[PDB]
Amino acid sequence: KKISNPIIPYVGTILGGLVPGELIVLHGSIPDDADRFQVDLQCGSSIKPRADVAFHFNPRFKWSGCVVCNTLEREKWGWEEITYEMPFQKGRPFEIVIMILKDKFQVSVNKKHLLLYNHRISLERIDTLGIYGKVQIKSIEFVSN
């Protein structure tokens, strides 16, 4: 459950799905000209109709920067939860750690807390990791309890 230099866009099955207490650990970097990227925890990888996204984590670099989180269900976006922080920096490496909990995802970037997001889709439905946009990824790891 460790992938080196994945191709972006990345779409891959999460072996065994996710359980509370586990981590998803991403090391990567942001290109000099980035606008946004996203990490999506998905129900499958269908394109038409588009796979549900249980957790859409979407850093956006415009202005002072923010991170938009949401859920896509039956091809409709829910209410956005926007964190007006930007820990990502153009031209710099990062580490993202997503801690899976019973109630929430908790996300840290570079070992600093970033945000919480309550589950909207049942955790057991998630079977696919997608990474899209202007981002480079050195490694993907799923860390057990």
Ligand X SMILES: OC[C@H]1O[C@@H](O[C@H]2[C@H](O)[C@@H](O)[C@@H](O)O[C@@H]2CO)[C@H](O)[C@@H](O)[C@H]1O
Residues that bind ligand X (CB under 6 A): 56, 58, 68, 70, 77, 80
Residue nearest to ligand X (CB): 70
3-state secondary structure (DSSP) of residue 106: strand
Closer Cβ to ligand X, 42 or 70, answer by number: 70
CB of 55 to ligand X, least distance (A): 11
Least separation in angstroms between CB 4 and ligand X:
27
Report the residue number, 80 or 103, with the smaller CB distance to ligand X.
80
Q: What would the two tokens of residue 3 be?
A: 């992938």
* Minimum gap (Å) between residue 83 Cβ and ligand X: 13
**Coil, helix or strand at residue 14:** coil
